Amino acid sequence: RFLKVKNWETDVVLTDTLHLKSTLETGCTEHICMGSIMLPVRTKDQLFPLAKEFLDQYYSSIKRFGSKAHMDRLEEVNKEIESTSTYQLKDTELIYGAKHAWRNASRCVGRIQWSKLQVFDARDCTTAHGMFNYICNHVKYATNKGNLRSAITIFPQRTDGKHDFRVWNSQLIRYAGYKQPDGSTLGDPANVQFTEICIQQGWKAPRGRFDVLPLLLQANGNDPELFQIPPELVLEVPIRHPKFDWFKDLGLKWYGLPAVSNMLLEIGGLEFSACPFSGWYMGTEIGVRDYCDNSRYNILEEVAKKMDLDMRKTSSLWKDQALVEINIAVLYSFQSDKVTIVDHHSATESFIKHMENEYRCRGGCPADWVWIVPPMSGSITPVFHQEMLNYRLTPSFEYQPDPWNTHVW
Amino acid sequence: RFLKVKNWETDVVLTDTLHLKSTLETGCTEHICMGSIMLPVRTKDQLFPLAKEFLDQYYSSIKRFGSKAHMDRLEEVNKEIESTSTYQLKDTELIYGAKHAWRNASRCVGRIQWSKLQVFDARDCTTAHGMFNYICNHVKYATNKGNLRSAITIFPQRTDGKHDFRVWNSQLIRYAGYKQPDGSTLGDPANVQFTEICIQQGWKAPRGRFDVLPLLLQANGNDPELFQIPPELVLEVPIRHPKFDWFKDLGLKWYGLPAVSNMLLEIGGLEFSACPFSGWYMGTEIGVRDYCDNSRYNILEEVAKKMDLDMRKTSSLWKDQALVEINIAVLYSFQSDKVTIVDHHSATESFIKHMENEYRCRGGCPADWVWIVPPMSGSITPVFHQEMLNYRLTPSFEYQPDPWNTHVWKG
Numbered sequence: 001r002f003l004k005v006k007n008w009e010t011d012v013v014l015t016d017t018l019h020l021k022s023t024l025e026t027g028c029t030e031h032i033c034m035g036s037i038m039l040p041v042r043t044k045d046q047l048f049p050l051a052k053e054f055l056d057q058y059y060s061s062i063k064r065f066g067s068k069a070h071m072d073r074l075e076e077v078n079k080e081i082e083s084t085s086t087y088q089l090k091d092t093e094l095i096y097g098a099k100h101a102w103r104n105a106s107r108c109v110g111r112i113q114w115s116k117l118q119v120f121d122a123r124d125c126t127t128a129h130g131m132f133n134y135i136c137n138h139v140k141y142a143t144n145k146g147n148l149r150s151a152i153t154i155f156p157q158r159t160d161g162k163h164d165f166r167v168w169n170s171q172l173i174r175y176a177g178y179k180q181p182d183g184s185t186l187g188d189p190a191n192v193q194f195t196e197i198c199i200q201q202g203w204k205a206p207r208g209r210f211d212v213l214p215l216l217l218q219a220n221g222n223d224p225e226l227f228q229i230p231p232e233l234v235l236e237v238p239i240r241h242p243k244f245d246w247f248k249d250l251g252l253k254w255y256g257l258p259a260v261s262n263m264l265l266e267i268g269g270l271e272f273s274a275c276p277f278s279g280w281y282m283g284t285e286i287g288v289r290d291y292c293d294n295s296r297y298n299i300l301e302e303v304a305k306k307m308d309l310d311m312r313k314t315s316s317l318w319k320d321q322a323l324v325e326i327n328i329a330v331l332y333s334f335q336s337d338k339v340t341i342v343d344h345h346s347a348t349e350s351f352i353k354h355m356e357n358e359y360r361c362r363g364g365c366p367a368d369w370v371w372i373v374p375p376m377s378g379s380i381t382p383v384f385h386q387e388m389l390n391y392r393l394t395p396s397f398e399y400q401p402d403p404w405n406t407h408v409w
Numbered sequence: 410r411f412l413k414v415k416n417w418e419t420d421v422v423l424t425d426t427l428h429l430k431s432t433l434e435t436g437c438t439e440h441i442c443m444g445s446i447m448l449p450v451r452t453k454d455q456l457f458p459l460a461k462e463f464l465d466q467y468y469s470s471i472k473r474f475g476s477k478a479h480m481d482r483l484e485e486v487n488k489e490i491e492s493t494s495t496y497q498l499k500d501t502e503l504i505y506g507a508k509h510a511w512r513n514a515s516r517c518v519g520r521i522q523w524s525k526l527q528v529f530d531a532r533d534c535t536t537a538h539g540m541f542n543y544i545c546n547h548v549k550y551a552t553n554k555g556n557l558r559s560a561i562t563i564f565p566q567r568t569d570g571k572h573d574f575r576v577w578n579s580q581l582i583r584y585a586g587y588k589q590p591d592g593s594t595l596g597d598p599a600n601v602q603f604t605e606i607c608i609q610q611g612w613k614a615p616r617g618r619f620d621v622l623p624l625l626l627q628a629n630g631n632d633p634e635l636f637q638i639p640p641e642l643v644l645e646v647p648i649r650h651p652k653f654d655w656f657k658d659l660g661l662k663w664y665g666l667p668a669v670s671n672m673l674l675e676i677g678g679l680e681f682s683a684c685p686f687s688g689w690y691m692g693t694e695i696g697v698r699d700y701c702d703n704s705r706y707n708i709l710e711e712v713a714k715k716m717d718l719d720m721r722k723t724s725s726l727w728k729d730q731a732l733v734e735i736n737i738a739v740l741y742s743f744q745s746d747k748v749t750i751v752d753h754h755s756a757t758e759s760f761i762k763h764m765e766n767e768y769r770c771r772g773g774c775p776a777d778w779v780w781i782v783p784p785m786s787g788s789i790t791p792v793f794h795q796e797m798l799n800y801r802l803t804p805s806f807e808y809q810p811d812p813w814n815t816h817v818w819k820g
């Protein structure tokens with residue numbers, strides 16, 4: 001019932017009770033753990049209980065649990081549901097729900113900042129142009145000339161599933177990927193397909209190594225449309241090393257604003273299918289994953305070459321030596337250009353502090369170890385030595401099928 | 410109910426049916442994952458069924474399932490159990506059992522070598538001195554002058570739980586740890602408690618930074634006894650860097666033979682509480698964990714200074730830079746002295762192949778991602794991108810409480 005989690009580097013022991021309020025499933029069972037698996041409409045009868053769950057926690061959070069207001073709102077929503085077969089969140093609820101969905105994202109290491117989320121209510125939106133306007137405003141607000149601010153823009157909630165809003169891009173800002181004759185790939189391999197759907201839509205690709213993709217926005221169910229983000233609104237950082245002058249020649253750059261746009265925000269049973277959100281990068285995401293993953297920019301060899309390291313034998317750890325340098329470069333560039341960014345050491349230390357805060361103020365903190373521990377230097381960051389309990393709480397952010405695999409043109 | 414795992418780097422998908430034969434629990438539920446949690450006498454009534462499942466697996470492995478030999482064996486064990494409340498494994502079954510416990514160890518990345526395990530049967534052992542002799546033989550055989558050979562030594566199984574054989578050391582070879590009155594620790598902090606017990610038992614500690622601990626052996630439930638492993642049998646490697654001549658001046662060294670000696674081996678319901686086994690190191694075990702964990706030798710700072718790294722701010726990644734060097738030094742020193750060792754790229758690549766093979770020939774391979782993925786450069790090794798399923802199969806290696814916490818001292 002009352003689970004305990006130990007930190008093996010400090011011996012600190014936290015007790016978890018928050019998991020008891022868990023509602024969703026984990027993919028795991030008593031006979032099998034699926035902890036490392038990436039991916040393990042509602043009826044009036046399904047909806048009301050969810051709304052109640054939320055409202056009860058919402059009112060409890062504002063110290064008015066079982067108040068007239070609580071009961072009243074509870075009744076009002078109840079009636080609205082039985083009638084409209086759905087409901088609308090007050091603004092106070094939308095904000096609390098979005099913040100808590102971030103608070104509950106077990107895979108996010110940057111949650112110590114959860115309560116500072118800026119919420120942009122775009123529930124009054126009705127067209128791709130409208131969505132494009134909202135997104136440009138989000139980008140400018142969050143980028144803030146390099147002094148990044150976390151934010152989320154919430155489009156109209158789902159109704160019949162045939163009127164859903166969706167941002168086809170996986171992130172507001174990403175580089176294109178094209179399959180060349182060589183069989184190899186130009187640009188970002190992860191976006192090879194989307195890069196094609198755009199073209200399949202009319203996008204004139206500059207066919208470069210770092211071409212900012214165009215937004216493909218879908219509103220009210222209609223087919224999606226393209227829009228190019230004002231270049232002046234896309235902050236970029238040219239990647240250079242603080243010692244290897246040749247580094248600049250590698251021709252590398254990345255965008256400063258990471259903004260996941262393909263997820264689904266769930267609040268009180270209501271589903272928001274278009275809810276792009278952004279914060280700021282942890283160095284390793286770019287330097288380790290985007291730059292060194294074999295199926296991404298896969299740039300380790302080149303950097304190793306330029307460093308003239310013995311690539312004859314894996315035991316010389318050239319891949320490792322280079323990995324470190326590349327990552328030092330990213331953090332150095334961003335910092336040099338005063339663009340917000342956090343290193344994995346500082347980010348992981350903050351998460352540990354945040355976990356302690358959450359354990360003493362909330363009785364727990366769902367966390368997915370597999371995602372929290374950085375892709376490099378795992379054990380020299382404190383989270384590696386931190387036992388974590390993963391469970392699903394609502395409100396939450398959930399994965400959802402790529403629209404192009406569901407859209408009925 | 411089939412289950413598929415995908416490798417997000419190669420899009421290769423494998424199907425697992427093996428998990429269906431999993432009986433033990435995981436610690437997880439439909440509502441919570443305890444995947445990153447370190448640690449989540451039998452009766453006749455429960456023993457025979459365990460023995461049978463085991464014998465059924467063994468006879469199938471040798472293609473004699475349902476044979477007369479199979480039936481007679483079941484009948485014999487059955488009789489032996491009702492007769493004596495337990496039973497003895499044949500030599501063949503023991504070897505098969507030991508190899509499969511290794512094959513089933515979800516946290517071991519070296520399993521591609523599972524079938525080549527050398528099994529030493531020490532079930533006729535009756536005393537601590539006898540245990541010491543078996544252990545010395547295991548160390549010399551396994552060490553093989555630097556050309557390491559995997560091996561396991563199996564002492565008498567548990568009976569009533571009051572006559573257990575136990576190796577009190579956590580590894581056959583390990584360095585002493587000493588807490589100083591000024592609060593600092595000399596040697597390996599991981600072994601301070603055990604070191605105290607040794608001193609209390611009579612061990613005259615030299616009190617240096619790399620003193621090989623004495624063996625503390627318990628036979629037949631008796632009080633444990635101390636024994637010094639002949640130094641000539643303990644292979645050690647002085648650590649030096651291929652480009653930094655000052656590295657040798659850190660005065661670091663490590664032993665060449667890693668031999669976990671505190672786990673419990675379960676086979677067909679039988680419990681082997683003293684079953685020390687050994688393989689060869691993966692570089693990062695020493696270089697990342699033993700040397701750089703804040704709670705182990707914790708050498709990152711000192712190595713950082715010597716490299717004149719910008720230690721003013723973490724974003725300089727001076728810890729990361731120094732970590733790589735230390736691990737390069739460990740691999741280099743070992744290879745130079747021709748002592749078997751495997752780097753994490755090589756070991757993880759081998760585990761991926763092993764895993765794929767296992768899915769194809771066995772229907773799966775239980776694996777603990779949290780433990781399989783190396784402590785440094787996680788994503789540049791293929792295991793990071795590999796989805797894995799973790800479940801418990803028997804035979805298996807299990808954790809057991811430290812004996813000093815359960816032993817009834819006799820005096």
Ligand code: HEM
Pocket residue numbers: 098102105107108109110111113117150151152260277278279280281282285342347371397
């Ligand atoms: C402000 C700084 C932030 C930092 C430093 C941070 C860091 C991270 C990191 C390192 C990951 C893993 C990314 C990956 O491997 O692809 C992650 C995942 C995630 N974060 Fe954040 N985050 C921040 C803000 C946000 C915000 C504002 C939200 C939502 C409102 C959020 C929601 C999540 C979710 C749901 C995931 C998992 C996404 C997935 O499954 O792909 N994060 N974050």
Ligand code: HEM
Pocket residue numbers: 507510511514516517518519520522526559560561669686687688689690691694751756780806
């Ligand atoms: C031959 C080379 C071998 C290599 C390279 C290898 C590698 C590894 C590594 C790197 C770990 C993680 C250790 C840690 O983090 O403390 C591990 C764990 C494990 N290995 Fe091996 N191994 C080998 C042989 C063996 C043998 C011979 C057995 C059994 C007969 C075995 C059983 C296990 C077990 C049960 C664990 C988990 C131990 C624990 O929970 O503390 N391994 N192995």
Ligand SMILES: C[C@H](O)[C@H](O)[C@H]1CNc2nc(N)[nH]c(=O)c2N1
Pocket residue numbers: 036037038370371372417793794795796797
């Ligand atoms: C298969 C495995 O789950 C997968 O590679 C995971 C591992 N940990 C991760 N951790 C983070 N933060 N992000 C990821 O994309 C992944 N990928």
Ligand SMILES: C[C@H](O)[C@H](O)[C@H]1CNc2nc(N)[nH]c(=O)c2N1
Pocket residue numbers: 008384385386387388445446447779780781
């Ligand atoms: C808390 C966390 O489970 C713990 O630090 C684990 C993580 N992965 C590990 N992996 C290996 N190989 N060895 C370990 O000791 C650990 N420790």
Ligand SMILES: NC(=[NH2+])NCCC[C@H](N)C(=O)O
Pocket residue numbers: 171258259260278279280281282285286289290
């Ligand atoms: N820090 C963040 N908000 N990250 C969001 C995910 C970005 C993704 N990991 C990338 O490197 O492109």
Ligand SMILES: NC(=[NH2+])NCCC[C@H](N)C(=O)O
Pocket residue numbers: 519580667668669687688689690691694695698699
């Ligand atoms: N490869 C092995 N057999 N390892 C056994 C465990 C050794 C332990 N991790 C150590 O660093 O001492």
Ligand SMILES: [Zn+2]
Pocket residue numbers: 028029032033034035437441442443444
């Ligand atoms: Zn699990």
